[PDB]
């Protein structure tokens, strides 16, 4: 029972050195695995990582939970509830819990049928630090040290483009000079090399006044100088993390891993559908081509049966590997994908403003099966959302609010509080957006966007993003520019020895799990506002990320068009919409004051 | 992929002609069936219906769900609660559900057992403008398209009578000279008349004042012509519904409809108990008479055994189905009920005031196994409660709260949040009694009325009624006057050739479920203030529905005599309520000043 | 139909007489018990309990369920929350749930496997009562009248010594001259005597003035001596409850109750690896004792196979059977723990403050596997929380939070709202550090202590109270005096005819399932601030417990001096924390003003 520590020295040049400082042996002893970690002794966030005594193979997936407590005691403040204790987590702590999860859940060996739950508790804080970052790598640590069959240790950093410069774990004070602010995870390599899995980037709401002011504004080719900028200090994370989980010297606990078929029923279906089922895969029609598949499984369910009795679960797992393999190898060899569609293609677009009677201002967005309305609402600044958080951030004057209801996708389902995707997708629209408002002071309006997510089949949170801009515009707000999204997708397969590379534009969601690498980008036309990524390949060619960026660039632009032909310029502000520049009763007028009609002189 | 569109002009002479728009075909194509409803092209409903793949038959019941989501930017104005979105549906909305499940729950051919669920979101808000009824037809519409097998299209409309004329769809700024608000929804049947399925009336705060000036008060009679006034409009509803299905032309679904029972287990179970059922059925003694059913159920159980191996739940279905006839049956014949009473019967009452100590006011009230405890709370009008919906609704000074609790019926249960019944049974009691309050400057008090369902078997919420009437005038409340209700059922049967009809006073639980029609009136000894219809027939004659009427209204009446025994006029204010007519410190009110316990001069 | 009453004669000399009287037949008559307790006809409690049709079996213990249901019109008050409703139960209404479920779970008939559900709903309240002991003995006159097979009656009393004398009910106003509080609850054996069951008690915030100026401190003999004066009344409330019962006289329905083994398999078992488990359990280790036992589960699941197929439920359930005798038996005999610890030996100890980085005040606290974490948080009065329940107390200085995550034991389970048990740990510690803090003019802060039970083995909630008394040092608050806390167990073994006693310091997890008797203390140095208590033995010499307190406070006065090496004197505040002694932008403080990050002069 002794204590063990590692560090992680990250060195910005002239903007200082930090530190952070690993954990482990006196907190949470009981935990599978626990780690504490520290930025300058300071910040503290303490990561316990639990598995279930027993596999859970009545499942399909593997079953992860993250959760992150924010304690108020960490910033020295009793919690302004009605009953003084913090309950429902905040934004930022459902937020953090993806960043977590999006690189974790892919880690752990696949055929792992334990329940394995994370808890990532925030401690200390100072006010001045940004503690996500910092429980991306406690939670890697504590699961490290759980011995549980992960690729870990995975290092999490945050890198902003200061000045010139790419500075890692920046606090708040220097992230004021910030152009883009990106969020980067990744493992090393057996060779040494960095292989980046999970990107969360965006612009700033400082970016268009510093590139006015001299900055470089963050471009594709910024971006991607920014990925190679993390990777060393993430090599660091991971060797203090690895240093620690040396030292501790955990036992490796037994974890069964569980196939999702044997090799013979692949062999069979194969040998008894490969050919129809590859001639199927050629229907570009939906409906059209279902009709065959739902057939196929037939001929197969028949060949294979009764020869295979109680073999249902691998008999579809192995047809669905089956697919995955028919359709990627099309997509290189034909250069065809699954619905008709070729490499760069992107489907049907539809734009217009107007769409609903009285709101502010409404858009709707159209990009194949994926439908996305967009309603903006205008008040006084007294009705923008007030904060209590672990946040420096006690006010916000834009909100972004994303639905999904299950109609979306032809299904039932609960309708009620929203689940995490909803705030991730919700966030990361609004974070794109938010580079090119107006000021406080040009438009003293609090603003609320709302999404509804009504046909969903590929990207809805991109489609969010161009809903929002004519929303807004159609509403009367000055946005500075433009903002449209589009989402990528990478198939990676080796031919014969060579290693070969083709990117997506527009994918649909089946075409998500086909692939290898997955990424969201919005943006002006001048630069990236939003970028999300999300990939196990070991790596990927300069070129080749350069490429897909360029492509997914070019989307982005031809998007851009179809929007401005609905609307160009902001519209006049609707009369419904308040106007903003004892008395209040002879004026009729609320105190900057307006709560007019419109009228009120 | 075009967009269809039907309308329904609904014309109200004098008070001008507005018109309900359908549209299908650019919002939600995913959805099993989508449809908006516009109102004047102004306010806004969208409604998707979805069902699940695969039926549940592992359920004994049609699974429906409906959610009405109230979107605050229909409005033009960002939620006001703390975190900016929207959250726990409001009154209106729950209240809403119902409307639109009680007349489409029963429209479903029996035997579905697919999942059904209808999101209906209200987008766009005219202020003076009622959504509810806007809802319904869009709920219906959506339905209609989905290629459910139900009994569409539901027709929906709302009249009220304004100054001797029945307006449907009211304006909020009309519903100003309402002396009786209705909402009624119905179906087309082949011969093109209508059949009334559902209703939901009440008089209004404005009917007493109004009737002294001049109008006429709300009897059985003008009640029963509002119900005539409405089919006209439900007709070019349904019309127009029927216009728009046609127009999109989507297609039936293959829903497969499950038997409860298939023919040779009825005749077999009939064959080996029908003269001992029918013999049992005849003691009128709940637990004397359950001894005996409990018997012949293995009497039958044994006959029908083993010759029917995992046959129960048909022989149970059946068993009920058998049991629903004989009672009906009996009814007709006999004129008897299953607990002995007549038809024209009520079960025995029992009413008293100040049945709980310290509360500003209480009364039980007792009718058969139904008691319900009614208390009464008296607060300074600053304790009324607030609200901040898509409502013109901004304060309510009377508030009604009905509890049911798992006990009430002999039973364990979730203790907790209240669910939809409870909403609803309280709203309609709290609009019973709300005609008769009196001012809030004549009575300058925050109301807040609890009915506690301590023991049910028979509308708890027309015992919640009365009870309500009794613990407020305890409490001082000065009533304009008493108010109470009854509950009753009625039978329609073709007995060779011909159809008998009778109907039940007060009916018990289970004679909800063997009759055709449930109605629950409540009112003064002048009028109505409360009017609730359920049925599926496709008509009853006027004489029939007045004889059911009149029959209710002199139950009504002799429940208002026994209460006036107990409470005839209000009492003296309790002591513990307050007396309402620096400084506050001095004279120890709070202040229209009051908080004084009593003495304060 | 006819209403029985019964009365409790509640003597208490020279402050008075005072009355419960109980009362059944005209409330809630459809639930399988119902009764109402009124204290002095005045505060009114009714009680409900229901039983499950069927047992429910599938389980491996007793479903018994309890509900308090405050209502806000007992007050005469409409809730205050926006909804005004009363919604989420406060800490009172879940606390007296603990209270009633303590002694009524046990008092079950063991095999019972009915769902048994309780429904407290206090109706009326004397704002100078106290509903919780009212409520206790309303919930065992329902569930006695509910033929249920247990042990009722259950007499609830609440003595506070006030002047040198033990007041039975205080009133809120009596309470203000008490230097202990005590809530008991027991039974009357058949030779007349008083079986205590359960007891919670605490010291107050007047306890020290109080002994200051003349009153007689809290000792284990003062404590002693108060349950002595809690017999008398606990025996005229059963004897009142007995009364009721007997003039209902319902019916003992026909309720099942299940065998955990039948006895041939724990002869079986027993022959099979007596000898084998008995060794095994002599391996203090845990993870090398547990290996054998895994082993041993072999031996003996082979032997007894397949003899027995079918019979694991009861093979697991005879073996723990067994362990539980052979565990006990070792204790007495031997008189050596399963851990290896002798009767009085406490786990390893370990204490520290400045555990945490930037917050107020923190301190960690080890015993055995248990591992506490505290910190504190100080901020301006107007933080204190604010309440409105059913309670003279309106706000709250000191609040207290304990935290007890799953991984806490090495699981994953839910993390979120607090459970029924961190509710009743928390309030447990909290209760026991109030009265030792300093007044509010003394010091003027609201004060937040949070405990983080991040390692858990043996109570956690005493290591709690260690935690918070460091903690709050640590922070600065000057305590009256350290509070320190111990777990006790008790093991009766009848060998050969006589009664042997055996109490346990420090007991494990599992000592608490081996015994017969659960207490834990807390206390200073002086005297006793917390006492909880749970059993089912019909009685213990007046040595045996004067002997078993004893024992427990040298281990409390222990724990104390370990705790006083850490942190002796209140440190000096944190500078993070403010000072406390227009003009608030000139000033830079908030106005009892202070704001002040420390400097403000």
Tied chains: 1, 2, 3.
């Excluded at 696949?110 to 940004?130: F, S």
Aim: hydrophobic share 45%.
């Amino acid at each position: 029972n002794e204590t063990h520590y590692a560090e992680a020295v990250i060195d910005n040049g002239a903007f200082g050195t930090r530190t952070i400082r690993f954990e482990t042996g006196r907190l949470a002893r009981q935990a599978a695995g626990s780690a504490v970690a520290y930025l300058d002794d300071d910040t503290m966030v303490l990561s316990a990582t639990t598995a279930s005594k027993n596999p859970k193979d009545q499942l399909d997936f593997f079953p992860l939970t993250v959760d992150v407590e924010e304690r108020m005691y960490a910033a020295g403040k009793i919690p302004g509830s009605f009953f003084r204790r913090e309950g429902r987590p905040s934004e930022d702590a459902i937020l953090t819990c993806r960043l977590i999860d999006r690189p974790l859940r892919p880690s752990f060996k696949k055929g792992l049928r334990n329940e394995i739950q994370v808890v990532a508790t925030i401690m200390a804080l100072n006010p001045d630090h940004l503690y996500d970052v910092v429980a991306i790598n406690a939670a890697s640590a504590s699961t490290q040290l759980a011995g549980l069959p992960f690729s870990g240790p995975i290092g999490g950093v945050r890198v902003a483009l200061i000045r010139g410069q790419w500075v890692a774990f920046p606090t708040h004070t220097e992230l004021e000079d910030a152009v883009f602010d990106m969020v980067v995870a990744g493992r090393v390599l057996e060779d040494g090399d960095v292989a980046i899995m999970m990107v969360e980037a965006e612009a700033t709401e400082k970016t268009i006044q510093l590139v006015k002011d001299g900055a470089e504004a963050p471009t594709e080719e910024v971006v991607a100088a920014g990925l190679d900028a993390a990777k060393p200090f993430i090599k660091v994370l991971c060797k203090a993390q690895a240093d620690l989980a040396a030292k501790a010297a955990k036992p490796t606990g037994e974890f069964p891993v569980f196939l999702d078929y044997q090799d013979d029923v692949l062999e069979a279906l194969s040998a008894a559908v490969r050919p129809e089922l590859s001639a199927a895969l050629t229907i570009a029609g939906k409906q059209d081509r279902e009709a065959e598949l739902d057939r196929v499984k037939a001929l197969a369910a028949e060949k294979l049966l009764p020869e295979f009795e109680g073999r249902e679960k691998e008999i579809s797992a192995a047809y669905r590997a089956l697919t995955k393999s028919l359709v990627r190898e099309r997509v290189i060899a034909e250069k065809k994908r699954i619905d008709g569609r070729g490499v760069t293609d992107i489907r049907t677009l539809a734009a217009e403003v107007e769409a609903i009677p009285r709101v502010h201002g409404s858009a709707l967005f159209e990009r194949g099966e994926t439908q996305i309305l967009g309603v903006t609402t205008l008040n006084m600044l007294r009705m923008e959302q007030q904060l209590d958080t672990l946040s420096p951030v006690t006010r916000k004057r834009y909100m972004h609010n994303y639905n999904f209801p299950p109609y979306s996708v032809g299904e039932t389902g609960r309708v009620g509080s929203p689940k995490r995707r909803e705030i991730g997708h919700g966030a990361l629209a609004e974070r794109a957006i938010v580079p090119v408002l107006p000021t406080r002071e040009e438009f003293p309006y609090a603003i609320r966007q709302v999404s509804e997510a009504l046909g969903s089949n590929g990207s809805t949170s991109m489609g969010s993003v161009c809903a929002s801009t004519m929303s807004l515009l159609n509403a009367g707000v000055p946005l500075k520019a433009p903002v449209a999204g589009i989402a990528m997708g990478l198939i990676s397969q080796e031919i014969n020895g060579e290693t070969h590379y083709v990117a997506l534009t527009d994918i649909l969601g089946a075409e998500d799990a086909f692939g290898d690498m997955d990424f969201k980008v919005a943006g002006t036309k001048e630069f990236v506002t939003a970028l999300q990524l999300d990939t196990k390949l070991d790596g990927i060619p300069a070129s080749v990320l350069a490429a897909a960026l360029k492509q997914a660039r070019d989307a982005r632009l031809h998007i851009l068009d179809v929007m401005m032909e609905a609307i160009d310029t902001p519209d006049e502000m609707s009369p419904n919409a308040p106007r903003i520049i004892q008395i209040q009763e002879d004026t009729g007028a609320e105190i900057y004051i307006g709560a007019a009609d419109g009228p009120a002189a």
